[PDB]
A paper describes a structure:
For this reason, we named the 20.8-kDa tegumental protein from Clonorchis sinensis as CsTAL3. Both proteins belong to the TAL protein family of the class of fluke proteins that consist of a calmodulin like domain (or N-terminal domain) and a DLC-like domain (or C-terminal domain) as in CsTAL3.
At first, we tried crystalizing full-length CsTAL3 (aa 1–184), but the crystal structure contained only the DLC-like domain (aa 83–177). The monomeric structure of the DLC-like domain consists of four anti-parallel β-strands that are packed with each other and an extended loop protruding from β-sheets; the other face of the β-sheets is packed with two α-helices. Despite low sequence identity, the DLC-like domain of CsTAL3 shows structural similarities with the DLC-like domain of FhCaBP2 and 8-kDa human dynein light chain (LC8) with root mean square (r.m.s.) deviation 0.79 and 2.65 Å when 69 Cα and 49 Cα atoms are aligned in Pymol41, respectively. The dimeric interface information calculated by PISA42 is that the dimeric interface area is on average ~1044 Å2 (17.4%) at the total solvent-accessible area of 6033 Å2, and the solvation free energy gain upon formation of the interaction is on average −15.2 kcal/mol. The five residues (G147 to T152) of each protomer in the extended loop interact with five residues (V′142 to D′146) of the neighboring protomer in the β2-strand via a pair of hydrogen bonds. The superimposition of LC8 with the peptide and DLC-like domain shows a similar conformation. This result suggests that CsTAL3 may interact with its binding partner proteins in a similar manner.
Numbering used by the authors:
A (entry chain C), B (entry chain A): 83 to 177
């Protein structure tokens, strides 16, 4: 057990186990979605996936493009990975 | 007064007054930067601007592209605007 090659990690504060099961849930339903409500309830079923599995309130952000974040202290789990040149940002916002 | 026409507001939890001074500081130095060594430390002198002016720790994310966030309760000031088709996201992470 390791992360699929399809998934390219940008950043993680997280166990591989939790990265992997984010992997498994994401890769099948993610590439189907292309314009805006495709993605709108995609993020939402990803958020709703995390809250069920990992606990707390989660924020899921999807990006088509390139980005730059200041670095600051970020308290909860965060996972950032590219799947087929589309970025996925996960933040647990509560426990 | 009002916001310059260049700035297209995506979301705000903020006074116009505080939105405007983000406009003021951003528009001159933001469009100049294209490289990652530019933008990487652009976000940073934007963050470092907000922390001095508005207080607390801020997270500034710049995007070249299109994006989708889940909707959730977001506690502090947040401003999101497009300037010359490059989006700028501000989050105060503490006060």
């Amino acid at each position: 057990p390791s992360l699929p090659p399809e998934i390219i990690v940008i950043s993680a504060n997280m166990s591989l186990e939790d990265q992997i099961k984010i992997a498994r849930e994401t890769i099948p339903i993610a590439p189907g979605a292309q314009t805006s409500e495709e993605l709108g309830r995609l993020t939402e079923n990803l958020k709703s996936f995390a809250d069920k599995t990992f606990g707390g309130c989660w924020q899921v952000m999807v990006v088509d493009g390139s980005y730059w974040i200041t670095q600051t202290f970020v308290p909860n789990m965060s996972f950032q990975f590219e799947l087929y040149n589309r970025a996925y940002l996960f933040w647990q916002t509560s426990e």
